[PDB]
Amino acid sequence: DPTIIIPKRANIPTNDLAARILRDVKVELVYNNSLHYVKIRASVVLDR
Amino acid sequence: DPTIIIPKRANIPTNDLAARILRDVKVELVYNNSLHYVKIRASVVLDRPAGQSTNAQTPMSSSAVGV
Structure with missing residues (x-):
């Protein structure tokens, strides 16, 4: 199943919040x- | 408080008693x-202000050295 996090x-x-980047x-x-x-x-074996 | 004397x-x-004036x-x-x-x-904060000082004592109101 696909997952997302x-x-x-x-x-x-805090550096990203200043630049507004996720x-x-x-x-x-x-x-x-x-x-x-x-x-x-395959293999043709015969009974005995 | 208002005062009255x-x-x-x-x-x-003696002169005032003759004139009858107080x-x-x-x-x-x-x-x-x-x-x-x-x-x-006013002031505005943009992002995550730094942690404040952890001092937990009563703030002394005066410096000890004054003499």
């Missing part, structure tokens, strides 16, 4: 991979 | 003054 006012350095927001994603190759393997 | 018969000149009654008062002008010194 935001910093609270108690962590923003940084360090983070997001997470996972990509859906396609298929490119397939390799079968 | 009245003289004494022994302190009145003098030298004195009164004092204090007036109360209204307000006409006012001044203000």
Whole structure:
């Protein structure tokens, strides 16, 4: 599942507040991979 | 407090008794003054003022060295 995290006012350095900038927001994603190759393997064993 | 002073018969000149007039009654008062002008010194803080002094003693009202 995607996740999102935001910093609270108690962590923003006073330098940013003077410049009015919010940084360090983070997001997470996972990509859906396609298929490119397939390799079968088998063995015809006979009962005894 | 307002004061009122009245003289004494022994302190009145003989001339005034003939004229039948009293003098030298004195009164004092204090007036109360209204307000006409006012001044203000506002201030504005922009971001996170620095931490204040941690002193927790009663402020001494005078310097020890005066002699």
